[PDB]
């Protein structure tokens, strides 16, 4: 952890200054879409969409009507 901190502090300062100046310090959504598109580049739409969900926040499970629909159909 400390290892990768050292390894990447240069990119850290780079991206933080550039994103803070560009969009007004909203590094959250900037880096969000950054990693989204970067991971989609290698055709990981599965992981990209589940990460879109995890950040969006929604429906980890199902509600009883849907489970009933499944075991009936």
Partner DNA sequence: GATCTGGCCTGTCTTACACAGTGATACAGCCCTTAACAAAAACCCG
Binding site for DNA (CB under 7 A): 37, 40-41, 43, 45
Nearest approach, Cβ of residue 40 and DNA (Å): 4
Closer to DNA at the Cβ: 7 or 45?
45
Nearest approach, Cβ of residue 14 and DNA (Å): 19
CA pair distance 31, 33, nearest whole angstrom? 6
Nearest approach, Cβ of residue 60 and DNA (Å): 24
CA pair distance 67, 69, nearest whole angstrom? 5
CA dihedral 66, 68, 72, 73 (to 10 degrees): 0
């Amino acid at each position: 952890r400390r290892a990768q901190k050292h390894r990447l502090r240069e990119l850290k300062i780079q991206v933080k200054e550039f994103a803070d100046k560009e969009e007004g310090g909203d590094v959250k959504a900037v880096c969000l879409t950054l990693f989204l598109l970067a991971l989609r580049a290698r055709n990981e739409h599965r992981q990209a969409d589940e990460l879109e969900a995890i950040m969006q926040g929604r429906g980890s499970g199902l509600q009883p009507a849907v489970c009933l629909a499944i075991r009936v159909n």
